[PDB]
Design a protein around this ligand. Sequence first.
Ligand SMILES: [K+]
Ligand SMILES: [K+]
Ligand SMILES: [K+]
Ligand SMILES: [K+]
Ligand SMILES: [K+]
Ligand SMILES: [K+]
Ligand SMILES: [K+]
Ligand SMILES: [K+]
Ligand SMILES: [Mg+2]
Ligand SMILES: [Mg+2]
Ligand SMILES: [Mg+2]
Ligand SMILES: [Mg+2]
Ligand SMILES: [Mg+2]
Ligand SMILES: [Mg+2]
Ligand SMILES: [Mg+2]
Ligand SMILES: [Mg+2]
Ligand SMILES: [Mg+2]
Ligand SMILES: [Mg+2]
Ligand SMILES: [Mg+2]
Ligand SMILES: [Mg+2]
Ligand SMILES: [Mg+2]
Ligand SMILES: [Mg+2]
Ligand SMILES: [Mg+2]
Ligand SMILES: [Mg+2]
Lengths: 306, 65, 512, 132, 196, 125, 49, 88, 101
Amino acid sequence: ETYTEDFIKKQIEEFNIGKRHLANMMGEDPETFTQEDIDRAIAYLFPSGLFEKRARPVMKHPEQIFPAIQWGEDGRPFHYLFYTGKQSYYSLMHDVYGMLLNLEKHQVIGSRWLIKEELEEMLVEKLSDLDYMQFIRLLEKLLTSQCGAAEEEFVQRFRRESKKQLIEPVQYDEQGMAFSKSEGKRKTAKAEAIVYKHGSGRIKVNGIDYQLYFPITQDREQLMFPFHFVDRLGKHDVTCTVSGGGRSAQAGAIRLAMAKALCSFVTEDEVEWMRQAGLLTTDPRVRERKKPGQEGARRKFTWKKR
Amino acid sequence: HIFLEKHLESFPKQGPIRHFMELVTCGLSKNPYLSVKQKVEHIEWFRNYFNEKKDILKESNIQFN
Amino acid sequence: VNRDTTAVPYVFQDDPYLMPASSLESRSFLLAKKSGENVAKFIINSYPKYFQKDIAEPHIPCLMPEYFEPQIKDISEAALKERIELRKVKASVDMFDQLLQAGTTVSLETTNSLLDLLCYYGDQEPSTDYHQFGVTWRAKNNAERIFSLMPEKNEHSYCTMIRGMVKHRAYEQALNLYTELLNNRLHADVYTFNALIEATVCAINEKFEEKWSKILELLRHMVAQKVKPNLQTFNTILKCLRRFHVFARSPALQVLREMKAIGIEPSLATYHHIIRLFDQPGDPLKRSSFIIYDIMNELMGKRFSPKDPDDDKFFQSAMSICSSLRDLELAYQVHGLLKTGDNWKFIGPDQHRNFYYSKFFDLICLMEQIDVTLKWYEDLIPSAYFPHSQTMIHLLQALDVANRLEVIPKIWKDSKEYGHTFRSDLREEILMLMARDKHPPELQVAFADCAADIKSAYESQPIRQTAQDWPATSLNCIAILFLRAGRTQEAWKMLGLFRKHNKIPRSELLNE
Amino acid sequence: KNRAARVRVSKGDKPVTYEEAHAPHYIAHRKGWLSLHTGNLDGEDHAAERTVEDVFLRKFMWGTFPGCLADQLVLKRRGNQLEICAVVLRQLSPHKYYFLVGYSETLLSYFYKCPVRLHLQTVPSKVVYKYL
Amino acid sequence: PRRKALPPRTEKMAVDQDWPSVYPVAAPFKPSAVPLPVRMGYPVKKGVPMAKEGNLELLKIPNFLHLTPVAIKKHCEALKDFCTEWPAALDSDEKCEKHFPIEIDSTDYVSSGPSVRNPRARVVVLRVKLSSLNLDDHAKKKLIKLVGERYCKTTDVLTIKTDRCPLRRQNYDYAVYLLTVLYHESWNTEEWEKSK
Amino acid sequence: SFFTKLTADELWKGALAETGAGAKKGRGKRTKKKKRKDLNRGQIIGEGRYGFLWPGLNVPLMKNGAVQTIAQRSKEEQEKVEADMIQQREEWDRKKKKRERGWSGNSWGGISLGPPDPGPCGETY
Amino acid sequence: NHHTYAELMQTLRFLGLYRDEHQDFMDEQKRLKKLRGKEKPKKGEGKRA
Amino acid sequence: LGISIKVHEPPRKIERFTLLQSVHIYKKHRVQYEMRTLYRCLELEHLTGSTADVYLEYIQRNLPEGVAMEVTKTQLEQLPEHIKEPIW
Amino acid sequence: HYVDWRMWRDVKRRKMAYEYADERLRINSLRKNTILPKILQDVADEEIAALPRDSCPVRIRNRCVMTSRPRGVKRRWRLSRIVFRHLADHGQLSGIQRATW
RNA sequence: GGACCUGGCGGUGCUUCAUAUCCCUCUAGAGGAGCCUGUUCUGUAAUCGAUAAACCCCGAUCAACCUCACCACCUCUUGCUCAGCCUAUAUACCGCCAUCUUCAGCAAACCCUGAUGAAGGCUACAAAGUAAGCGCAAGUACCCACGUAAAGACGUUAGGUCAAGGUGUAGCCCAUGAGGUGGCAAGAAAUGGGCUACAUUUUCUACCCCAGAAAACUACGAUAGCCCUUAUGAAACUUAAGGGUCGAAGGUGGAUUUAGC
Ligand SMILES: [K+]
Ligand SMILES: [K+]
Ligand SMILES: [K+]
Ligand SMILES: [K+]
Ligand SMILES: [K+]
Ligand SMILES: [K+]
Ligand SMILES: [K+]
Ligand SMILES: [K+]
Ligand SMILES: [Mg+2]
Ligand SMILES: [Mg+2]
Ligand SMILES: [Mg+2]
Ligand SMILES: [Mg+2]
Ligand SMILES: [Mg+2]
Ligand SMILES: [Mg+2]
Ligand SMILES: [Mg+2]
Ligand SMILES: [Mg+2]
Ligand SMILES: [Mg+2]
Ligand SMILES: [Mg+2]
Ligand SMILES: [Mg+2]
Ligand SMILES: [Mg+2]
Ligand SMILES: [Mg+2]
Ligand SMILES: [Mg+2]
Ligand SMILES: [Mg+2]
Ligand SMILES: [Mg+2]
């Protein structure tokens, strides 16, 4: 399916007219009718629940939907590297190799090299893996040299979240005591923890003293871990409510909630140590499903080699 | 539908038959799938059935009508 | 919600290929869809057992097979009433003799229910899914045989006999049968008196003066038997008087002045029979003009209900009288009275509807400004009615008068969508108008684009029985529209067709 | 290997439709459903009786509109109503289409005791998604 | 000769028209009626989504072209003559339980198909607090022993659920009959109530 | 039953056995290849054994300016339509059922293949 | 009820309003076996006796 | 129409079941199918019979294909006359 | 016009089980109790055993409605796994999709 | 017969390897006992099919009658069906799958090489290959980017199934069809998979994790046997549950072998 400039020019007029019709249906002003409203009106008038968002109704501008002749009537190719097959890729290697010769004559985090799939969009040319590596080798070579200001702009074209815990807002109760509330999750257990700023180290889970609620020592050890690490045991009063899961799933969920709510009463440096200790991360390990042809999630039925 | 002991006036007031027919009318009163015309059919069928087993019901000391 | 002006009637499929183009397709597309419903009912009543199963809750009695065949196969009095409700004329009359021959007493209410079915259809079977001129009242018909056999006759007996004769154009005999009714000291009903006025005038083609005296005698007998007239009684008098166009003018009004006194709201039909009587092909139409004006004011701002079958015909009659008078102020009242409430259902069948809109849109173009005339053309057409050639030609004579010759390349595209692609008279008035005078380049190049589409029509034509023929004027005009436009190259290729078909070229084409 | 509802690869001269070009594992990701009723919803009933009607309706229309069906039917139910939506070729004359609409609508309304309406959408030629 | 399809009426449509008149009631997507260049489908390599003409994916969708905001506001303006005003006195829910202490439950089910029947529509639940009834010490104590687990002490609400009879009007009359016999039997003191 | 009926495409695909293990490696003789036939080629919509004439479908909707009604062909007239249909079927089959040999009758050598296919850039041979 | 479904569409095929491609198939295979000699025998007058 | 309405979304339900992949044998190879039911509760308050009647008809008629409805109605009644005082 | 004789037999079975449903219910009620005398219960044991075998509901088999397959049938759709998948794999069963989790 | 090509094979070489895998190495098992269950033999008047990997709690998310196709006896004949067939052929097929695939290759259409032989077609500081389409991948589902599902070609094994259904061909048509009554589906033996155990990290009870008893010929240990009752059902030594009685083998298992990051 080849689309010429005249065909795309007629599609530009049908979208503009269709954009004024869709505004009359919804009762909006045609002039200030952006593309976000079109996406909202087409999702109401044509409700599709297809998981793929590329298979749903879309009424976009023809320049964002549709993805030219390389010779004139005489037949002479415009570009001088037409017969190479990759005139766009080789014109770029010819330009980069020409800037590396001038340098000889007169003489970072958050950024990544353009990926292969993104480099075939700038050139509209299919590229092999090896050719992409060759191009990257020249750009890196360019950077090592004392490149001028203009060169930095050229390289920048081909180049493309702070791991800090979110502190909870300290609140105040009717009496005036300061605390912080957070939530945790472990397997199927969900927990909410309230950590008072000043306390005598009393913890109540679901209205029951923690030692009564958690008989097994291991569970109590998990509760201590956050406070022991920040060397402030017997200084806060905790009131949590865990629901779901089992014995060991409930403690883990409380540990994470207390730890998150105890980050509001500690310094920034201490919160980073808690993060590096694995006290503020949610364990993503959950039960794996069983498969129709196997005994278990990964266990297989006995192979009758016999 | 719920008060079906008006139809047991041709049955013994006391006895096993009454205890049996007090279970039929309790189950038929808990039935939202039958009409009242169909519930009486059941009751009339037993009345005709116990009139034909009178000789068998005299051996077991039961005076049905 | 209002009507969609860009769509055809809902009954049709909303699809360009299935959309009715012309007016012939419109009527022929609904008759083929009605033929599928008759071919389905045929199959639903011939083989009911397939459709007897019922899964609907609540029960739909209108989606169940009908059972015409009678069930009671015995010979009793109750087995005959079952063949009279199923309108089995032949079976009932053949099964009555056997019952009568046996000697079983037959009620008077069951023999009067057989005459009704025989006197109505006239001893003929009703039309069935599958198995005008002259008089259909045979002399050797059951209706008269069973009438004599009867040992006792009440009022209803004659009443349902007189109405059966007039219906089958047996007027002369009904009057002879009405003299016997008078000899038996009986009293007729209103329905029997209604048919006696139709028979009286129709029986003999005498002068109106004699007929007027005759009709007055029945009405005086109607008041001597404590009989109250209804709407239909007056409606027949007006319908009957239609023949005496001039003379009846004043008398017909008298009938309308007696309907008000005795409290009989005239319906659409009562007025439809007056205008037709008054309406005549006369140039002055002085009397007709006043009549319609008064009638419309009385009817103005009213909602109508069906009372007589002729009510539908009124709207067609009024518009016709308005186009003859060339009055557009009176056509906006008639069409404004058709929109109130649900009066839009009295317009009539497709034939009546197209005639009404045609005469209507033809008086709008001629008489009103060309800016509104193009608003009525976008609303009505095609949602209301498909136009006939004379309406597109009537519209072209309005643009010419309104110096708006830039819409002709739009009137020709529509014509092709309404079935006038190959209308000689249409293409012969579009080309001449475009080529009549020189126009600026931008407008002169558009007319050439219509002459290149009108020229293709001549080259390819639906009827191949006769050799392709090009009118002298068309070829004369298509060539001069190319020159002025600038398509000289193609202007020289048409020269051969002038002599090929012996078509004389005009001097204005050679000079240029 | 899996075979269900898959059109095997060919030289390239075989034209397939969007629905015919997608396998069963795309039925809710890239495809919808050809029938839409409530029978299969949680707590709904009469799923086996709406199914038998669909199997018969697709065969009734395939044999009643022979050679005219470009794509599969889209059956829609709203209360008592049943809406049949079809894509058809333009080869057949319109006169014959209107006959088949009034015959099928009426016959199927007396057979399933429900108002049935049929909505045709003619297409010049069978829309082709790609050539397998 | 071979019939030729007409151009779509979309071209005739104006930008400032009345859409409700085009799509007054529910109908399938008609590309010849919808004046929008809307596409659907999963694109092939270096391809675009399928067009609306002949698209079976846009016909499966249950569209809301008949329920545009302009219409709803236009429809409901004509439906304000059918509605009645709610008594202003009944501000909150605490005031509704003072004049109307009884709450009746009834459910209607809407499913597609030819039959509208549903056995779940016969169930009727009646809720009523015991504080709104003229009961004394003895009556209230006896009434809680007859109903068993139908009374919740936490909320002091008696719930009566009746599904015995086919119709919902019979189960409502039976629930009101049960409330009367329990009220008139709670006030009646027997001679066997002294052995408590 | 009526629910155990397939379509023509499915019936021929299984009858021809074009795609099978036998075809793959010279395991099937070509002496009597099965041949697909279209059973809808000469069928008119609305024509059945009973001979019913459906207005608007089988026959013209309107005759002599008036709409026709449901009619059924007579036995004599319907017997002539079934026999005339057979003749068309035989004629169509007969036409489907001369060659110039080369060096030998079964030899390919010496046979003409015609001129080569024309080139895209206005080249012909 | 397979009878109703199988009897309705048998009647509709004889009336010409339903085209069964499956019967056509097996109407042609049974027509090509009469020409090949493989015709069903008369009842009673079978190969065995 | 002037009706108070609150909207929430109850947790969805997913019914799954397994079937044999092949017509014959090959028990270890099966196929799994599911039906997804999604809910949406519209809790209106302080209506009247007439107001609920037209509103329910309006939304019920426009209910799209594949969408069921369960309308639970809580009616306000008054104590019956007999319940007012005991029959001494 | 049923798939096979096996299906036809069940159709009769289901028709004869609907006619004697009430008669069998009334007779079993006598048997299913400890109230009535054994003499009467022994007479009812002979009356319900003399009725046709096809009236017994334990002889009814839930076969497929298209292929009359006795096993591998889904009760909600009354279809075999093979016929169910065919319609489900073609997107003809509203709501039915393949499960992945 | 000589000399080549391809493919397969090799108790053929070399090198990189398998990341729950080839071997060693970690953990729980199997094989030993009893029971359950399938198969094979044998047996019976008394089905069929799968049957190295890729059969063996497989078709069956299921057989007291029914299901049922089997056997014996009796019966019917245009027969529920504009008949019918669970009759043969899966080596005629569709259809749905297995398998290599815990892969990436498959391939139209061109081009070139080899003197225009079958055949073959890479080297990135590049030497003849380009490639739609298919699969992979990407997307999607589920709790994300992870992982698990799903997907997974073209071919291979004339792999599996005519007994899902349909169907080509050959065959039966007072019978190879249809219906009824009764009935068998066992166990000398061998084998596969599984359950429970041989106990003290255990047994019983209370609790649901701070306890008290038990503890080798009245211990651990049968879901078996025998007897009764109950449930379902028209029908139960018969199916299932429970109780009672009973208290066996077995004392942690050879060569070999399975699964799992
Ligand atoms: K080799
Ligand atoms: K063992
Ligand atoms: K096969
Ligand atoms: K088979
Ligand atoms: K066969
Ligand atoms: K074992
Ligand atoms: K134990
Ligand atoms: K072991
Ligand atoms: Mg395990
Ligand atoms: Mg020869
Ligand atoms: Mg597999
Ligand atoms: Mg028993
Ligand atoms: Mg059973
Ligand atoms: Mg065996
Ligand atoms: Mg048996
Ligand atoms: Mg095979
Ligand atoms: Mg084999
Ligand atoms: Mg993944
Ligand atoms: Mg898998
Ligand atoms: Mg994949
Ligand atoms: Mg047999
Ligand atoms: Mg038997
Ligand atoms: Mg035991
Ligand atoms: Mg023991």
